[PDB]
Amino acid sequence: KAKTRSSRAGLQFPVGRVHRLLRKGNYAERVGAGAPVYLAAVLEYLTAEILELAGNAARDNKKTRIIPRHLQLAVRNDEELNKLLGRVTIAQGGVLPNIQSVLLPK
Amino acid sequence: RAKAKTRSSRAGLQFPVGRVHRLLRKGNYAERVGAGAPVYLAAVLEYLTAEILELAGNAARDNKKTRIIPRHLQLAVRNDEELNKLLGRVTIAQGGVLPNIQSVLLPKK
Amino acid sequence: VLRDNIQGITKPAIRRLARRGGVKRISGLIYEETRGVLKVFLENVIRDAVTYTEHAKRKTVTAMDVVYALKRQGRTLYGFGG
Amino acid sequence: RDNIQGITKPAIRRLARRGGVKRISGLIYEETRGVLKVFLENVIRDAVTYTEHAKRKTVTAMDVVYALKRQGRTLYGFGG
Amino acid sequence: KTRKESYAIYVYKVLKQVHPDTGISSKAMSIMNSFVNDVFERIAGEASRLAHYNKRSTITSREIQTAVRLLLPGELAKHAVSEGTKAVTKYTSAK
Amino acid sequence: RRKTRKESYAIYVYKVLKQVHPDTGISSKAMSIMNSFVNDVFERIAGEASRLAHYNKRSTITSREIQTAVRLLLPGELAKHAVSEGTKAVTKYTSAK
Amino acid sequence: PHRYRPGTVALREIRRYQKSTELLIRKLPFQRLVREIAQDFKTDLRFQSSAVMALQEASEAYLVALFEDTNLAAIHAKRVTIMPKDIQLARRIRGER
Amino acid sequence: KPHRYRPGTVALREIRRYQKSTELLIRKLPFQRLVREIAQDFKTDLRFQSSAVMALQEASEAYLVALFEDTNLAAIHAKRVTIMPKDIQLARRIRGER
DNA sequence: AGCTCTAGCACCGCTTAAACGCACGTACGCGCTGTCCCCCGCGTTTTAACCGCCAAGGGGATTACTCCCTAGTCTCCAGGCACGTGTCAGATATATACATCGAT
DNA sequence: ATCGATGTATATATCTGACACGTGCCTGGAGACTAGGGAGTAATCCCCTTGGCGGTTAAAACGCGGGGGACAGCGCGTACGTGCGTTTAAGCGGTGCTAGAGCTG
């Protein structure tokens, strides 16, 4: 029986596909054994943070299904993921509901 | 065997065509590198170097110097609007800045 | 040949775009200035996208090419493929 | 320590002269110091990390140049 | 080919592991796939460079670790790097 | 003792300068600066050419990839000049050996 | 009849359009503008619908970010009205001018 | 009486002097001590090349001068001459650093 | 070069919400003035940055040696993506109760 | 204060098309083995960095007057928000058809 490398590392993201993309992307002439495992773990951790924050935003909007607006609210509200994707715009995302204090009425 | 003649002389360039091909192969940008790609890249590099060098020579002549210093390169890059756009995110060491004063900062009589 | 479609970016469209930007009050020349800024931005992005399209021997500008043209300028766009 | 105060007020004044400013408020300098410190943080947070990759513990200029290349501010003058 | 390779099912598995009752739209799935591709490209590019810095021709776990410490912001990295080592541990204990 | 054969574009920048300004000399710091400039431009052209080569599923980098990368990242008018100069070099490479 | 004070309906639109997330520009005029601009680079081009979608929303995001910067430098100048000089100041500080 | 310049007169001369100059306007040893205390928080017992400190000084001064041009521009935009910390904060906000 | 088939373009008709032009009131940008405060010019003190020189030691570069790790090849299979189905999350309608702005 | 519109937070019945789940397959991922070349490790060395002392001087620190620029306050008038009738074209549905994307040899 053959057991996949993702279950060896306890990960959901594909280790073998990440290894294939690293080799076929021609980043280096050789690729170590643990590097695709490490990269897949980092990718699934980041996906877990984005999806958890988006699910919290969807629950706050009482929506069962995550829409791109929830993704934008997830990235932009978290200040630490914000500068990771500061240059990145998001499809159908909109902006945070921010109004300056001077423009507010008395 | 025929006489060894460099590809730069064949292309009519001063920049090394063979070194550009070697760095393209060793940089691992793609598994295959064409024949004319190092020629084209060497020509582009030579043209850009010639442009900034002649602008820096003009800047050194304006300052009446026969040696090009980093200040001359800074003045050559920034005074040309389009080379400034190429190197808008580049800082030149010991280059200084353009002498520029805003209009309202000047005193009035 | 299309002519004078920059006025298609209308008065209330620019007003709506400023409302999403948190702008409360808008001057008169803001509309013309934003039309110019949008024109130069589209000129840059469309020029890069057409340059990407010509390298593939294609005559239709793919959304994928627009995405990479936006990525080359540092404004990475998600949601249209990566 | 006190070495952040080692960037003395005439130094910020000279940098503002090179930037083209006549008048400098008294609350600028320390604020400028803080900004400078913050900027240095980022570069050092890259540069030593490159040193951490090299199994070295001296920071060469080459690592600093490629550290500065990361934030988008390429520095010409020390190598490529 | 006709085959459309993406990260849809893996992001779906991660979402169901985190929030089992929460679904995702197809557009949001496209944003997630593009986000995974972009972050993978960023980390792989930094790892390729860090291999080129020290005249190394291979990408090991140290390359990816240093690339994460440069690219992903601070305590996220302080999580992710540690978490990554755990995966490497599970790749070494299970063999 | 033994030393690595340090690699730079020092002589070629000097030959180009003597081509455009025979009288004018140049300092060593400007050798470092110009070498860094040409290395940076080489890296960005080569990376962009690899990037387009990956985009069209092409395993090779021809002169077309370099030309399109020059049209992409270099700003406008000099780009055409560069393109023309590059094309001229290609012709001088094809007319000769 | 009833009439609101000037400035409060605008604040209602700020809350409305920041909460909502669709396009604020009409699709066909933006498509015609894209066709007008693209014909300067090559005659008889064609565009995917998703290409026009991506162009429109990227332009919308860029203009909204520019409007954020413009409003910030407008309230920096002790004003609630955005002026063109606010826009040139924002684009100059951002590095695109 | 000895000749005393008007306030802001020799300031313009000092701007003109330092804009055409290229030497480093921050002293070498205080900036070196600043670098070594900042690097102490990331790894103890570090060493530094002299050219590394020179590169750090060049980049820091270039960034600070560019920030000073931006803060001067937004100070002029506020119909003022004196630069304020709010102007620096605005410049960093528009540049996307905060 | 060749074949397929698909979506992009062009046109047409209906509807209806968005835009536009105009009337109108008033909020605010701008100009002007008064005040005051705090930064700049400059003289006097002081201090440490810098230049020069020297000791030292240790660490990055260099070489040789080894060994084991991963590209490569071969073979097999099951997981991941086209396609189909079905079913339900969200939009839309009503109804009911709450916080906010305007005008008096 | 006060009430009336006016947008906003909470409970149920209906539809749809977009997403969750099931089927099929085939191709890329997994198991096994080898070489050999790249990475890890030990010994040297020399140069490059760190540390220290004299001095001494340019630059930093400090005091202090003042004046000019920052900031607060006030008047205005005009430019811009708001409302309403109109009309203009966006949006949508349907038809057709062909240039060209995409795939293969």
Automatic annotation (TrEMBL), chain A:
GO cellular component terms attached to this protein's record = nucleosome; nucleus
Q: Which GO terms describe its molecular function?
A: DNA binding; protein heterodimerization activity; structural constituent of chromatin
**Domain Histone H2A C-terminal residues, every copy:** 79-106
Its job: Core component of nucleosome. Nucleosomes wrap and compact DNA into chromatin, limiting DNA accessibility to the cellular machineries which require DNA as a template. Histones thereby play a central role in transcription regulation, DNA repair, DNA replication and chromosomal stability. DNA accessibility is regulated via a complex set of post-translational modifications of histones, also called histone code, and nucleosome remodeling.
Residue stretches making up the Core Histone H2A/H2B/H3 domain? 1-76
Family affiliation:
Belongs to the histone H2A family.
Task: Give the main localization category.
Answer: nucleus
Q: Where can this protein be found?
A: Chromosome; Nucleus
* Name under which the protein is recorded: Histone H2A
